Chain A
């Protein structure tokens, strides 16, 4: 019925009928895809990271209000404290608190930090289209937008349930390239002002703008050597540089840093050489190539080099966390299956029709490859890059090979590219379900085939802290659980992740020490009420402070006794780790072998503790300075009634 389908006025109108069709249902895909990590299990927050963000997020819609209220806390980091002097970027928080200024006026706070990331993906897959229109074609982006819609690693680090500080930094970064690349292509400076005003939104959120000003001017440096200057590079570049520096200057994390740090200082030197080389081009083109331009060329060169001499004279556990370590192809091709293959293709096309705009993306294809060589966490920077050029690459190959026929090689080459590429969307559907559909606070266990044990000791213990403890308290265990203890417990704490003061964290190692008499004295120094540690012993693949214990073992600072010497005890005295009866006895007299272990000879049998495959048999019940506070449901966390 209604046979007038493929005879509408296409390439003008039905063009747009199909355009906005894909811009609908492709953008459906990113938001829809993130969702089954929280549809499968959770409701609110997967990782441990969004808690510290979520606390201040609901704060800056409750009582704080950033233009008229920044904020101080004594609730965190007793007795030191940390405040919006740290935590670079309210761009997450002002976004979320703006969304439930508006939608809350339209009438929840659950649904604003968990639903946000799917929203980010949807928005980003529509800004990547308007980006990729500018490069080859509107037709180039219509396969490219789906690519960042379902590149599964970019999905993975921002899932339904993510609220990371780089959770929307990517959107800003991508957007600032839409807000750079037809400013370079067209020196429209109202529009370049809109570019720098967009740049401010990135330069809020996450510190990748130290990357970006590592990128943007040195790209410009490339345009020295290829020699493809114009005005319409320069007139757009000066704006987002110089105005953007002051918009960064508004922000505290980058504060008077845009005067002083070795990266954007050299970016400023590049801006100066760029503005000189524009001016140089202007003069000396009215004059001849005379001898005397060589004469004051010598003069101005000596003044410029003495500027260079005056400038060069005046120059004013995280590694362990498994992800900041370097990654192979698994983050790779497991990450980015078909879309690795097509990456050089458009890049060859970008070195084929090397236009003015595309060289920026080529430099962006170089740099982020070099930088996602060392940090898989930084993989997100290569998350859209590949999707850009592969977005070109297929749209090259497809365009050249639906060219030839309907207007037998194309009877293969079109015909492969469906099943060549769409196998991708099988992979993207499901690797997202395998590795990344699992929260940090709820651990999926093993043991049955029907109604198997898959169970919430963290909310049980943390909600015990939120009922049966005093108001003023102590929370001290270890730093990577520091935010979550401030999630539901509303409890005052000593340490936390970031690590702006390293000394304060280093005496927690002597709080988790060998000598209980000195460790408990360091405790008694620091206003104790409660101590926590986590187990992983009898099911294994959970963490805790016993496998980052090597880190504690070599952590060393403000110390001379014990924690000076990295061995301390912990090896067989030829130099190999044992813990058991065949282990080492000051480790038997250390905390963490008795701090954790009470009554475990008396409960499990058959010589286990699957982490070590250890044994029952130590007497090991000796609370010299504490008492128990929580007898455990699943050996989860022994809360420590800190005794006088």
Chain B
């Protein structure tokens, strides 16, 4: 059934996110040492070592991934057929899903560049 697909996409970001860092769990975001004045500002996603993450890093990554895929699901399931409201609902659907697609890929590109320092 399609509920099995629901189960799998549920499992998707669940084991993209943090099952690897369930036992190696590293707490969410604080690592600044006063930087000049202000003591313990929580920093970010980890950047210097590549393999590590925190809980807050992983969840964000997983969320970015499944929304993109299910945006393509929405492109398939409704935008290619022609049955519903042919000027109001459809245009919304392609609009927000194209927004999903473009801004999602853009921000994930940003969230690999800034933790990664890769030449873009």
Contacts and interface: CB of A to CB of B under 8 A. Distances in A.
B112 interface: yes
A347 B8 contact: yes
Looking at A330, A334, A343, the one whose CB has the most chain B CB atoms below 10 A away is A330
Contact of B102 (A331, A345, A416): A416
A223 interface: no
A351 interface: yes
A332 B102 contact: no
Interface residues of A, number: 45
Interface in B1-52: 2, 4-5, 8-9, 11-12, 15-16, 19-21, 23-24, 50-52
Contacts of A331: 51
Interface of A: 322, 325-334, 337-338, 340-345, 347-349, 351-352, 365-366, 369-370, 373-374, 376, 393, 396-397, 400-401, 409, 412-413, 416, 420, 423, 430-431, 434
B75 interface: yes
Contacts of A430: 119
Nearest to A420: B105
A351 B119 contact: no
B52 A328 contact: yes
B72 A393 contact: yes
Contacts of B66: 344
Contact of B94 (A349, A409, A420, A423): A409
Interface in B75-120: 75-76, 79-80, 94, 98, 101-102, 105, 108-109, 112, 116, 118-119
Contacts of A366: 8
A333 B108 contact: yes
Contacts of A373: 15, 19-20
Contact of A329 (B5, B61, B75, B102): B61
Interface of B: 2, 4-5, 8-9, 11-12, 15-16, 19-21, 23-24, 50-53, 57-58, 61, 65-66, 68-70, 72-73, 75-76, 79-80, 94, 98, 101-102, 105, 108-109, 112, 116, 118-119
Contact of A341 (B19, B65, B102): B65
B36 to A, nearest CB: 23
A344 B51 contact: no
Contact of B15 (A334, A370, A393, A434): A370
Contact of A344 (B52, B57, B69): B69
17 contacts: A328-B20, A333-B65, A333-B108, A334-B50, A341-B68, A341-B69, A341-B72, A342-B72, A344-B12, A345-B72, A345-B76, A348-B72, A373-B19, A374-B19, A400-B80, A409-B94, A413-B98
Contacts of B73: 344-345, 348
Nearest to A351: B5
A40 B30 CA distance: 39
Contacts of A326: 19-21, 23-24
Contact of B58 (A328, A334, A393): A328
A396 B65 CA distance: 19
A340 B65 contact: yes
Looking at A337, A340, A412, the one whose CB has the most chain B CB atoms below 10 A away is A340
Contacts of B20: 326-328, 373-374
Contacts of B4: 351
B94 to A, nearest CB: 5
A420 B108 CA distance: 13
Contacts of A330: 50-51, 53, 116
A345 B68 CA distance: 10
B5 to A, nearest CB: 5
A400 B76 contact: yes
Looking at A344, A374, A416, A434, the one whose CB has the most chain B CB atoms below 10 A away is A344
Contact of A334 (B94, B105, B116): B116
A366 B10 CA distance: 12
Contact of B101 (A332, A409, A416): A416
